[PDB]
């Protein structure tokens, strides 16, 4: 019989290479910020970076992906300072899920949800603000998952609603960095050239799906990404 | 009497903590580039960063915040190379004010106003250009101010017109860095991870106000930012 | 006679200063990514940076510079997952030319052409991807040129089509760094402040020309940039 062939041994080694690839320092960290929309559609901000990412997604970036929009924004910019007839935008998301596939340094993950002008935790003066907020380092709150990548340590999910605890009309700061358990830094003087040369790969993608089911089958599953659906099931 | 209570002593200390917070290395540097528009409205580019900022705002970013616009741009891109019927855009600003609240290294502030393609000081060949221009390091030209933050050393204002000395149809490069009077660098090998992790917080905001009075009362005053109005009065 | 005057000696020295200026570490590296469009127009992405550049141009950035566009994008995002009636976009480019004027480190030039989501070389899983691709480091494949800058070593051109070998509906990652033949790094701890302070100058420009002839005479020639026209002639 061919019950334990050299062909099969080779595959087994290749399986391990594939499963451990996220730990490869020249791989990507993959983060997906899923935003759940008022018409039941999903908007996924898909980000891949080798080493680090730091970007604040504006209300405009989140809501797309005229004078009426402007009048509305006026009211988000200044309390009681706009002439809009509606309290909230049809285009704002109602909930979110941040999911990760990569060797992330969990202590480096920042998710700060603020108002239109990026004010978070009710702290509304530029002079009082700092880069370290209350609801900010979500690392400890990220759950593990089963699904395709069950039993690995490089998938994590965190979700919530856009309610008054954070903001109902949001901008969202997201940052993260790749883990390093070894002594030599990838930001060391020897490596800064590379940290910056590859800093732009890739640009965030804004992916609209007709509903969560469509998101799962047209993107999550075929791209082999982790995901927790609204019923709690991990893929 | 309660003429000098422990309650009041505590407040006094808190006042000092607040007043000195801009010096806190985990605070934000706040810069506002106010642009004065041809319909009397104001467009404020509001920027907060912990450590550094470097971005060239394009004509498109400044003028927003079709084929007619394109024909016009053609003429800015190449002398006498476009078919537009107008000499300038209704959407271009006529004057500007850069104001700062933060422990800025004044020698690090660059404001370079160029034409559509970012050519400054009449130097129009990419091969001749450098990152150091004539009208560029505005530090020495920044004035102090009174107003809310009178008697502090971390507010500064600089203004001017968009005329032929710089450009009447502008793009604008703005960079700055936080001061450091101490020996250990925030770009040191130990700190580069952080310099880049927080580099994106926050995104620039583009804030449109109906007029300068509205800007002052709906944004400057309630956000506790410094500002010099068109009559020279500091807030 | 005035056959060899001090006036002429001065000019000769100035000619050398000008010709060698690209080697000046405070000059710009200039890169132009020319994209050739289906209506015969050209779109030039014009980039100048002092030290490094790293950005992935999205399909949206390339194609500009509604529900129909969305339905089309759906199909690029997921195989057979969109309802569009057309196979390709009228707005996609058909070929490209990357040309450089600057003291580029040729080993630092990355040009990775991927599909809508930035997948390159047929590798379509985020977990399998790395920052080093097959068709990626184009340095060795860049040709020298004659034209204005004949006999210099700081001009290079590389071109190709957007076909199935790369992608017919592309996003494009472009990175590069300035050469350094000396011992002290411009990313060294002493210099990181500067590497980042000037990192944003300039923003990429998206320049539309009516045809290649117009591109050459309205931009290439008067800006003194190198260029190879469709007949192989260098300017
Ligand atoms: N001195 C204090 N004693 C008790 N509670 C406080 C005190 N200061 C703030 N809090 C409470 O802490 C919570 C968060 O307040 P906040 O985020 O404004 O923090 P803070 O300590 O006041 O910081 P800052 O000086 O930047 O305003 C609020 O519930 C607030 O009432
Ligand atoms: N190359 C690596 N770099 C960083 N971490 C690693 C690497 N290889 C393994 N690890 C860590 O060790 C853990 C276990 O690895 P591995 O799967 O090889 O062991 P195992 O015997 O199958 O036991 P386990 O049930 O923990 O997987 C991984 O989940 C990962 O967090
Ligand atoms: N050799 C020179 N002698 C006197 N004036 C000069 C000389 N070169 C330039 N200038 C003057 O200096 C001013 C600025 O010129 P410009 O910004 O082009 O500087 P530059 O010294 O010529 O630099 P570059 O070599 O980059 O062109 C102009 O008024 C110009 O006439
Ligand atoms: N923690 C700090 N970091 C950096 N600079 C500081 C710090 N504290 C004070 N300074 C500098 O010293 C100046 C004076 O500080 P302070 O207000 O404590 O002194 P003062 O006795 O009230 O006199 P002054 O009239 O200068 O304020 C400040 O304006 C500031 O520029
Ligand atoms: N073990 C192998 N033996 C022979 N050819 C291979 C092998 N693996 C891949 N190839 C071939 O190499 C070419 C490129 O494949 P690909 O880019 O997927 O590289 P790869 O080595 O399989 O990397 P990865 O493990 O990331 O998929 C293809 O023509 C493929 O058929
Ligand atoms: N300052 C510099 N920094 C970096 N490289 C330089 C510098 N000066 C010259 N070189 C390199 O040396 C080459 C030749 O320089 P130069 O033109 O001064 O010599 P030449 O005698 O005219 O011979 P050639 O025919 O090589 O030009 C240049 O093409 C360039 O690549
Ligand atoms: Mg292999
Ligand atoms: Mg408080
Ligand atoms: Mg395991
Ligand atoms: Mg306190
Ligand atoms: Mg000159
Ligand atoms: Mg004082
Ligand atoms: Mg000179
Ligand atoms: Mg393979
Ligand atoms: Mg020579």
Residue numbers in the entry:
A (entry chain A), B (entry chain A), C (entry chain A): 1 to 65, 79 to 248
What did the published study say regarding this structure?
Cypoviruses, members of the family Reoviridae, subfamily Spinareovirus, possess a single capsid layer with turrets and are commonly embedded in crystalline occlusion bodies called polyhedra, which are formed in the cell cytoplasm and mainly composed of a single virus-encoded protein, polyhedrin. To ensure the delivery of virus particles to the target intestinal cells, allowing the transmission of packages of infectious virus between hosts by oral-faecal routes, polyhedra are disrupted only when they are exposed to the very alkaline pH environment found in insect midguts. The fold of all the polyhedrins is highly similar – a β-barrel core sitting on a base domain, surrounded by a common array of five helices (H1–H5). The strongest intermolecular interactions define a trimer composed of a cluster of three β-barrels sandwiched by helices top and bottom.
